[PDB]
């Protein structure tokens, strides 16, 4: 379902264990009200799509991974296929989230 | 110079002590590399303009004030005149920062 990332090691290895699957990462934070509003739809998507991997990084716990991926706005969704970043956008837009997933799967 | 805000009380009272002056607030965070890149220009502006008040809120310490002002991206600058928010933008753009200050002074 949604995998909670708590280190750079786990981020790196999960992208390595994903194989050829799409990985969608949600960069969220506690003070972000839109990030709270979209957490249930984010979790529903992981159950709807079994062949996509869904990760969550709270920028406050993983400030290193947050600076590396150059997160600007809350929430940000970055999309990875074989360790290459293939997409990214900011904002809690549910249609575009699922729309981009269906584009990169 | 740049006043460090560490509570909702200090945010509220500084906007109250500003009187009729412009207050520019910098919503920053530790993991934000652009927020680091623009901190010296932010501090230079407080010395250049003695008749404007310059505040800094780190969103990680003041998560309440951060949710209330509905901060989305790092950094955000919100502009206040007599407690009314008169402007806001996101991004570490130095010309627009100073350009908006000269517009609302």
UniProtKB/Swiss-Prot annotation, chains A, B:
Single Gene Ontology BP term? positive regulation of peptidyl-cysteine S-nitrosylation
Q: Effect of altering residue 73 to D?
A: Strongly reduced S-nitrosylation of CASP3
User: For the site Contributes to redox potential value, which positions are given?
Assistant: 33-34
Q: Return the InterPro entries for the record.
A: Thioredoxin, Thioredoxin-like_sf, Thioredoxin_CS, Thioredoxin_domain
Give every Thioredoxin domain span: 2-105
Stimuli inducing this protein: Up-regulated by ionizing radiation.
User: Changing residue 73 to S: what effect?
Assistant: Retains its reducing activity
Q: Which parts of the sequence carry N6-acetyllysine?
A: 3, 39, 94
Q: Where is this site: Deprotonates C-terminal active site Cys?
A: 26
Q: What molecular functions are annotated in GO for this chain?
A: protein homodimerization activity; protein-disulfide reductase [NAD(P)H] activity; protein-disulfide reductase activity; RNA binding; thioredoxin-disulfide reductase (NADPH) activity
Modification after translation is described as: In the fully reduced protein, both Cys-69 and Cys-73 are nitrosylated in response to nitric oxide (NO). When two disulfide bonds are present in the protein, only Cys-73 is nitrosylated. Cys-73 can serve as donor for nitrosylation of target proteins.
Task: Report the CDD domains cross-referenced here.
Answer: TRX_family
The outcome of changing residue 72 to A is:
Strongly reduced interaction with CASP3
What does the annotation give as the result of altering residue 60 to N?
Loss of pH-dependence of dimerization
- SUBUNIT field: Homodimer; disulfide-linked. Interacts with TXNIP through the redox-active site. Interacts with MAP3K5 and CASP3. In case of infection, interacts with S.typhimurium protein slrP. Interacts with APEX1; the interaction stimulates the FOS/JUN AP-1 DNA-binding activity in a redox-dependent manner.
Its biological function?
Participates in various redox reactions through the reversible oxidation of its active center dithiol to a disulfide and catalyzes dithiol-disulfide exchange reactions. Plays a role in the reversible S-nitrosylation of cysteine residues in target proteins, and thereby contributes to the response to intracellular nitric oxide. Nitrosylates the active site Cys of CASP3 in response to nitric oxide (NO), and thereby inhibits caspase-3 activity.
Q: Which family does it belong to?
A: Belongs to the thioredoxin family.
This protein's name: Thioredoxin
Q: Which organism is it from?
A: Homo sapiens
């Amino acid at each position: 379902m949604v995998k909670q990332i708590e280190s750079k090691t786990a981020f790196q290895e999960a992208l390595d264990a994903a194989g050829d699957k799409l990985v969608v990462v949600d960069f969220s934070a506690t003070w972000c009200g839109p990030c709270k509003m979209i957490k249930p739809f984010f979790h529903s998507l992981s159950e709807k799509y079994s062949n996509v991997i869904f990760l969550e990084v709270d920028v406050d716990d993983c400030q290193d991974v947050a600076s590396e991926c150059e997160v600007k706005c809350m929430p940000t969704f970055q999309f990875f296929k074989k360790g290459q970043k293939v997409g990214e956008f900011s904002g809690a837009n549910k249609e575009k989230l699922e729309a981009t997933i269906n584009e990169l799967v």
